[PDB]
Amino acid sequence: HLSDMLQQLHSVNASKPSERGLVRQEEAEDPACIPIFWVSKWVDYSDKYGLGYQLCDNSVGVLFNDSTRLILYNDGDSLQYIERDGTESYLTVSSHPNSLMKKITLLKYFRNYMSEHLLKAGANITPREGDELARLPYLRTWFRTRSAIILHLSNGSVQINFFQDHTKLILCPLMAAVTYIDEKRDFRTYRLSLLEEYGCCKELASRLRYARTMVDKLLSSRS
Amino acid sequence: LHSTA
């Protein structure tokens, strides 16, 4: 999905959306393209353990430093563990699977911390309903720059959270759509092809150019 | 080290 996302970004950036003779940004909105999943909260303990995160459906996950992943579903009991080599196993917290108690304990710690202390990004927003059978996406990779943290989910979504003004972009290659959460926490979703037609403000155009640079970085660091 | 408090 990254290559597709890159092409979609090249396309919108090349149309120079903030230079449109008449920018009609609202005409490019499409609430139907709101994501099913995004990252609502995160904790970076990557010095010793890894990166913990909460998705907007209240499930939590950790990408540990040893390349393994542990996901706790929002029922607060069902677990998925993904080993280095990609093997996935379903477990429960209440079973107490001994070899995983340290990782389970850390995930619980992160979960409680996020729940007690951190704001839920997109708190106001009802996620799009997904198919019940679809697997819960997990964090494929992440990195931080001086201006943002970049989070790449296994369903192809890329989310970029800007440090300075708390603005956020969530890019969805499957719909060729972007959700922009602005400095006032207002949530707007746009179809990229419509942004090409109707243009957009300098603030959104700037962030979309930065997004292309970030997708190039993801593609350059892939595996 | 964490998202917005």
β-bridge mates for residue A149, sequence order: A144, A161
φ, ψ of residue A191 in degrees (nearest 5): -85, 130
**In angstroms, rounded to a whole number, what is the distance separating the alpha carbons of residues A137 and A52?**
14
- For residue A45, what is the nearest residue in chain B, using CA coordinates? B1
Contact A138, A71 (CB under 8 A): yes
Sorted by sequence, the CB contacts under 8 Å of residue A30 that are 6+ apart come out as A177, A189, A190, A191, A194
Task: Domain count for chain A, please give it.
Answer: 2
A179: domain CATH number is: 3.30.1120.30
Same-domain check for residues A161 and A209: yes
Does one domain contain both A170 and A102?
Answer: no
- Contact criterion met (CB < 8 Å) for A118 and B2: yes
Contacting residues for A111 by C-beta, under 8 A, at least 6 apart: A52, A54, A60, A72
Per the CB < 8 Å rule, is B1 touching A161? no
d(CA A129, CA A175): 14
Domain boundary among A83, A117, A136: A136
Supply the angle between the helices A202-220 and A2-14 in degrees, to the nearest 10: 150
B3/A161 CB distance under 8 A: yes
For A165, the closest chain B residue by CA position comes to B4
Between CA A189 and CA A5 the distance in angstroms is: 16
Same domain flag for A12 and A25: yes
Inform me whether the C-beta atom of residue A142 falls under 8 Å from chain B C-beta atoms: no
- In this structure, the answer to whether residues A98 and A73 fall within a common structural domain is yes
Instruction: Give yes or no for A55 touching B (CB within 8 A).
Output: no
Distance from CA of A148 to the nearest CA of B (A): 11
Out of A136, A166, A191, a domain closes at A136
Domain holding A68, by residue range, is: 40-136
Last residue of a domain, one of A84, A116, A136: A136
Residue ranges of the alpha helices (H) in chain A? Answer: 2-14, 101-117, 192-198, 202-220
> Least CB-CB distance to B2: which of A42, A121, A166?
A42
